[PDB]
C-alpha cells in the first residue's frame, strides 16, 4: 500500500511473502528482481516463489530454505534460478523473517545480489554482508509501514467512536495513539538520523519527536549522528535538549564515537555543550583514552582544554598517556606529558 512505496526507494533486489496468506506468496518485488527475473508485478504477486526453480536447481538447497521457513530462521544459500525465458542465473539470496506482529513472525524478506555468475571465498562473504544489511534496511522501512497503518486505523475508530458521542472511548484510543505515535517518531528520528536526513530529523523533532529516544542498545539520535559525523543534527539535537551524556549497552555516550571515529568539529560541539569530558564506557574508557590509544592529536587537545583527566585508567590500569605509548603515538604521548 503505502509499504508498496519507500520500499521502491530501496534500489536493490529483493521479495517480501506473507506466510500467514496459504502457499507464502510475493505481496512486493523490487524493479532489481523484476527486470533479472524477465517477469513483472501483475504476473509474480499473489504467486509463491518456486517458480524461480527449475531442473539445476539443487533439491537439498530448496529443502534448507523450505525449513528455516517452516522453523521461522533465517538462511543464506547459493542456487540455480530460472527467468522467465528459462535462462539460468546464480542466485545467492539471503531469507530473513520480519518479526514484531505483536513479538512474532509477519513476513519474510528475500534478498538476492546483484549477479549472475558462481560468487566464492570473501568476494561471497562481502556480498553476504551487503545483502545481509539490506535487509536489516527493508525491516525498519517495513516496521514502520506497519506503525503507520495502526494509527491511520486507530485515528478512524476514534472518528467512529466521536459519532457515537461516546467520550470515554474517545480518550481510550487518544492514549493508545500518543504511545504508538511517541513510538513511531523515535523509530522515524532514529533512521532520519542514521542516513543524516537533516529536514526529517527538522521535521519530526517539530512534530514534538523525543530526542532523547534510544533503540534496544540505548543507542539515542545522537549516538548515530555522532556515530556518523552529522554536524548539523548534532547541534539541532541539543537544541531540542537530547541529552549530551545518553550512555549505551555498552557505556559509549557520544563523545565516545565521535573520539573513536575522530570527528573533531562534533567532539567539540558536545563539549561546548557540557559533554562530561571524562564518562567511562564499561571498560573504563574515556575519551582521551580512545583518541590517544587511535592516534587523533587533534581530538586529543581540544578534549585537554575541557578539563580531560589524564591519570583516568581503564580496567587493566593504562592512562590515555599509556596507550599512546603502547600505539607508538609518540607526539601523542609527549603533549600528555606536558599535561600530566
Keep these: 500500500g503505502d509499504l508498496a512505496t519507500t520500499l521502491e526507494r530501496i534500489e536493490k533486489n529483493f521479495v517480501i511473502t506473507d506466510p500467514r496468506l496459504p502457499d507464502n506468496p510475493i505481496i ?10 524477465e517477469y513483472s508485478r501483475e504476473e509474480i504477486l499473489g504467486r509463491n516463489a518456486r517458480f524461480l526453480q527449475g531442473p539445476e536447481t539443487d533439491r537439498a538447497t530448496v529443502r534448507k530454505i523450505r525449513d528455516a521457513i517452516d522453523n521461522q530462521t533465517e538462511v543464506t544459500v547459493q542456487l540455480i ?21 505483536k513479538g512474532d513472525v509477519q513476513y519474510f524478506i528475500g534478498v538476492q545480489l546483484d549477479g549472475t555468475e558462481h560468487v566464492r571465498g570473501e568476494l561471497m562473504e562481502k556480498g553476504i554482508k551487503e545483502i545481509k544489511q539490506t535487509a536489516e534496511e527493508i525491516a525498519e522501512a517495513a516496521l514502520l509501514a506497519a506503525l503507520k497503518q495502526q494509527i491511520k486505523e486507530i485515528e478512524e475508530k476514534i472518528k467512529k467512536a466521536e459519532d457515537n458521542g461516546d467520550e470515554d472511548k474517545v480518550k481510550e484510543l487518544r492514549e493508545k495513539l500518543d504511545k504508538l505515535r511517541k513510538a513511531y517518531l523515535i523509530l522515524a528520528l532514529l533512521e532520519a538520523a542514521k542516513k543524516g536526513q537533516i529536514e526529517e530529523v527538522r521535521r519530526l523533532l517539530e512534530l514534538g519527536a523525543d530526542a532523547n529516544g534510544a533503540d534496544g542498545t540505548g543507542t539515542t539520535p545522537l549516538h548515530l549522528a555522532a556515530y556518523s559525523g552529522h554536524l548539523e543534527i548534532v547541534e539541532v539535537l541539543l537544541k531540542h535538549g537530547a541529552d549530551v551524556d545518553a550512555s549505551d549497552v555498552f557505556g559509549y555516550t557520544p563523545l565516545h564515537l565521535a573520539a573513536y571515529w575522530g570527528h573533531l568539529e562534533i567532539v567539540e560541539v ?20 580512545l583518541a590517544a590509544k587511535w592516534g587523533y592529536l587533534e581530538i586529543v587537545e581540544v578534549l585537554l582544554k575541557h578539563g580531560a583527566d589524564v591519570n583516568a585508567q581503564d580496567k587493566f590500569g593504562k592512562t590515555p598517556f599509556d596507550l599512546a605509548i603502547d600505539n607508538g603515538n609518540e607526539d601523542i604521548a609527549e603533549v600528555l606529558q606536558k599535561a600530566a
Excluded: E, I
Excluded at 81 to 101: A, E, I, V
Design 81 to 101: 534460478n530460472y527467468t522467465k525465458s528459462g535462462k539460468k542465473f546464480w542466485n545467492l539470496f539471503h531469507l530473513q523473517p520480519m518479526r514484531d506482529q
Design 28 to 37: 512486493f518485488a523490487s524493479d532489481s528482481f523484476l527486470q533479472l527475473t
Design 270 to 289: 558536545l563539549l561546548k555543550n557540557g559533554a562530561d569530558v571524562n564518562a567511562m564506557d564499561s571498560d573504563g574508557m574515556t575519551p582521551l583514552h
